[PDB]
């Protein structure tokens, strides 16, 4: 009867919005198309490095620091004679060196949301050249191939260590005196124990915020490795769109997802939300047991040693 005063003041306003917006996006999209058509422009040329190789070499970072290599940089190891030596980064400073890096995150430099084979062969930049110097004393973002990681552990009693740093600056650890990863044939099944640490045993006990059944589906110990094209997560369903790896954007021992997801997505700043994630999941460099599902680290790294 009187809803006739709207077409005068209510709508000529319930409409001005759409303008102030659909005008903005339409505009704020060109910026993007622009950034990209640019980065694509840059990429016509790849980034280069020159990592002259250090004389010293062994079966792995340990033997090496034992053979005299005392600087943290890139070394060349050959654990098993059945395979040819591959390059790897050795941490010879933190916790009495001998540390062989398996995984490292420190900037956005590398895409981790990759396929199965890649994770199996490894990818990323092992090390970049130290400012000036002729050796790559600086590590890069990478994931030493799965097969290599497997074999490294199936050699002898291997201990694992995981470090991470938040954006404000504080740190934490996650020791696992025992660590192993079966071969490809066995879906690189993980397995750990002896948790020394300050980050909270995510891999074995699961999130510190999920109760009962909800937590046990966050434990990684004994889990298989999953990638966005090879399912093996604890999530069992007919629905294909539901695979922890497709969501949580990465490749990792998923068990109906996670409690800790390194190799996740590298969100800058650390503070991130669901209405920000490509899939609305807590994908990202996260270790729940220390910052909750909504915080991607500024640095995350998995290094090994024998013991």
């Amino acid at each position: 009867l009187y809803i006739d005063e709207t077409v005068n003041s209510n709508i000529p306003t319930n409409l001005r919005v759409l303008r102030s917006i659909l005008e903005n996006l339409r505009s704020k999209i060109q910026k993007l198309e622009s950034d990209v058509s640019a980065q694509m422009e840059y990429c016509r040329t790849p980034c280069t490095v020159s990592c002259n190789i250090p004389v010293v070499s062994g079966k792995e970072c340990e033997e090496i620091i034992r053979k005299g290599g005392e600087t943290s940089e890139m070394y060349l190891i050959q654990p098993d004679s059945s395979v040819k030596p591959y390059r790897v980064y050795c941490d010879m400073n933190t916790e009495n060196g001998g540390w062989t890096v398996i995984q490292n995150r420190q900037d956005g430099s590398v895409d981790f949301g990759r396929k199965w084979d890649p994770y199996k062969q490894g990818f990323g930049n092992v090390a970049t050249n130290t400012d000036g110097k002729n050796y790559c004393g600086l590590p890069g973002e990478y994931w030493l191939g799965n097969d290599k990681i497997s074999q490294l552990t199936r050699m002898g009693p291997t201990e694992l260590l995981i470090e991470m740093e938040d954006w404000k600056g504080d740190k934490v650890k996650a020791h696992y005196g025992g660590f192993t990863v079966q071969n490809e044939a066995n879906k690189y099944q993980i397995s750990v124990n002896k948790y020394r640490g300050t980050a909270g045993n995510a891999l074995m006990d699961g999130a510190s915020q999920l109760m009962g059944e909800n937590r046990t589906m966050t434990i990684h110990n004994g889990m298989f490795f999953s990638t966005y094209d090879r399912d093996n997560d604890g999530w069992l369903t007919s629905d294909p769109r539901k695979q922890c790896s497709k969501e949580d954007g990465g490749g990792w021992w998923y068990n109906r997802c996670h409690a800790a997801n390194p190799n996740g997505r590298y969100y800058w700043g650390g503070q991130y939300t669901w209405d920000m994630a490509k899939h609305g999941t807590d994908d990202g460099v996260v270790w729940m047991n220390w910052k909750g599902s909504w915080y991607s680290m500024r640095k995350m790294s998995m290094k090994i040693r024998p013991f």
Partner: peptide, 4 residues
């Protein structure tokens, strides 16, 4: 990440 947890799925109920």
């Amino acid at each position: 990440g947890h799925r109920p």
